[PDB]
Amino acid sequence: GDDRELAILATAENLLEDRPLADISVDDLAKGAGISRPTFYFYFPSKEAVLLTLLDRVVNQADMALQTLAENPADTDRENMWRTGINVFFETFGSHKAVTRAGQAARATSVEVAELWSTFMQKWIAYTAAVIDAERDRGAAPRTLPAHELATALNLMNERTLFASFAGEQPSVPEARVLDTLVHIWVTSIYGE
Amino acid sequence: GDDRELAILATAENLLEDRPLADISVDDLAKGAGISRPTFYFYFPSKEAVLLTLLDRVVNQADMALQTLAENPADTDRENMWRTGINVFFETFGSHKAVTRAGQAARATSVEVAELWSTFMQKWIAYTAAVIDAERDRGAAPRTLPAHELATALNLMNERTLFASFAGEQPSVPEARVLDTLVHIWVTSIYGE
Numbered sequence: 503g504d505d506r507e508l509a510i511l512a513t514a515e516n517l518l519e520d521r522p523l524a525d526i527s528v529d530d531l532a533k534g535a536g537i538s539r540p541t542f543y544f545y546f547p548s549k550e551a552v553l554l555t556l557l558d559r560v561v562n563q564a565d566m567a568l569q570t571l572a573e574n575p576a577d578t579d580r581e582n583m584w585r586t587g588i589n590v591f592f593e594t595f596g597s598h599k600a601v602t603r604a605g606q607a608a609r610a611t612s613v614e615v616a617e618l619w620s621t622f623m624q625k626w627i628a629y630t631a632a633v634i635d636a637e638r639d640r641g642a643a644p645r646t647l648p649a650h651e652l653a654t655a656l657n658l659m660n661e662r663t664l665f666a667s668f669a670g671e672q673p674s675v676p677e678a679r680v681l682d683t684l685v686h687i688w689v690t691s692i693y694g695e
Numbered sequence: 696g697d698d699r700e701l702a703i704l705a706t707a708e709n710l711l712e713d714r715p716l717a718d719i720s721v722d723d724l725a726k727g728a729g730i731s732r733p734t735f736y737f738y739f740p741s742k743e744a745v746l747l748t749l750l751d752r753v754v755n756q757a758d759m760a761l762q763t764l765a766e767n768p769a770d771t772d773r774e775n776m777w778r779t780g781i782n783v784f785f786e787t788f789g790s791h792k793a794v795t796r797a798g799q800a801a802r803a804t805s806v807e808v809a810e811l812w813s814t815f816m817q818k819w820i821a822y823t824a825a826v827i828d829a830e831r832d833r834g835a836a837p838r839t840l841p842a843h844e845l846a847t848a849l850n851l852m853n854e855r856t857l858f859a860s861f862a863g864e865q866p867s868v869p870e871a872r873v874l875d876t877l878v879h880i881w882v883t884s885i886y887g888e
């Protein structure tokens with residue numbers, strides 16, 4: 503039950519490593535999961551719905567990791583605080599490159615996928631702005647841009663830059679340089695006069 | 696000749712303001728341009744090719760504006776230098792929101808559109824890095840990140856952030872705040888220790 507379901511999800515994530523969702527069939531997913539096509543339709547209405555569930559898992563995994571961090575302060579300078587936070591997204595999405603890639607592309611064709619990204623990005627921006635505000639209240643960060651607007655641009659930078667790196671797009675920051683690149687821009691823009 | 700062609704381009708840009716390219720027909724474009732469908736096929740192979748030509752015009756317009764700037768230094772602080780430069784992209788693409796939007800979306804489905812964006816973004820990143828390097832050589836900017844990697848992330852930030860603003864995406868920086876937001880992040884990340 504949960505097992506045929508997990509098998510479908512696992513097969514899907516595996517096949518997305520070798521080709522886009524458009525070139526993966528329900529027959530492909532049913533075969534890999536060791537079920538029939540009708541049985542597949544019991545668990546999911548479409549291959550699109552399978553991707554939505556995989557994305558939902560990855561996004562929630564990042565979100566839960568960030569919550570864990572937010573409850574367990576690492577005893578560290580402000581630079582490492584931001585780095586450890588950005589690193590949740592670098593490792594979580596970077597550990598699931600095929601779902602990241604397919605799920606980013608599905609934003610264009612799926613209202614549910616677009617709304618999932620939007621909902622979480624809104625949450626992560628709100629948390630970023632809350633942390634900036636705390637830094638300003640403690641006198642460590644200067645009162646420059648509206649915190650929520652700065653948070654929005656930094657979050658959108660990370661989305662575009664991380665995913666371009668993972669995809670090896672031209673242009674992109676090399677994956678082995680992208681964390682240091684983003685941390686630098688976050689720290690200088692949050693603390694800089 | 697060039698006139699039926701310009702009419703097709705103008706009709707296309709006008710119709711893209713009210714709906715996506717998928718919901719615009721060649722009949723729609725031929726009618727608006729006051730020609731027949733066969734005559735249309737003389738000027739362009741597809742509605743896709745029409746969008747590519749419109750994008751090509753917008754991208755080259757931004758590029759030519761930047762070249763103009765690069766030959767005519769405004770007598771100004773470093774902050775206004777970067778602002779005037781970012782503003783080329785804000786005004787050029789923001790003056791052509793429907794082509795920007797459709798052309799951004801076509802990256803997913805058109806190798807020629809993806810390669811056009813890539814080619815120009817590579818040029819703009821190279822120029823950004825050249826300016827940063829000049830700032831470092833004159834002793835105004837510190838030698839922090841590799842210039843080309845910093846340039847890449849700042850350019851990708853601007854792409855994602857400007858286009859989200861123009862589209863009114865959730866989340867996005869309000870359009871009336873996006874220039875100041877980007878300039879702040881550019882200046883603090885380029886000059887900041």
Ligand SMILES: CC1CCN(C(=O)NCCc2ccccc2F)CC1
Nearest residue numbers: 584587588591626629630657660661
């Ligand atoms: C899809 C994208 C992926 C990249 N992304 C991202 O790196 N945000 C960083 C969020 C963050 C870092 C440090 C402290 C708090 C905090 F919220 C947003 C979502």
Ligand SMILES: CC1CCN(C(=O)NCCc2ccccc2F)CC1
Nearest residue numbers: 777780781784819822823850853854
């Ligand atoms: C599609 C995107 C749109 C946004 N974008 C962009 O703002 N780049 C800024 C480029 C720049 C600014 C100042 C000086 C030199 C310089 F090159 C890149 C391309």
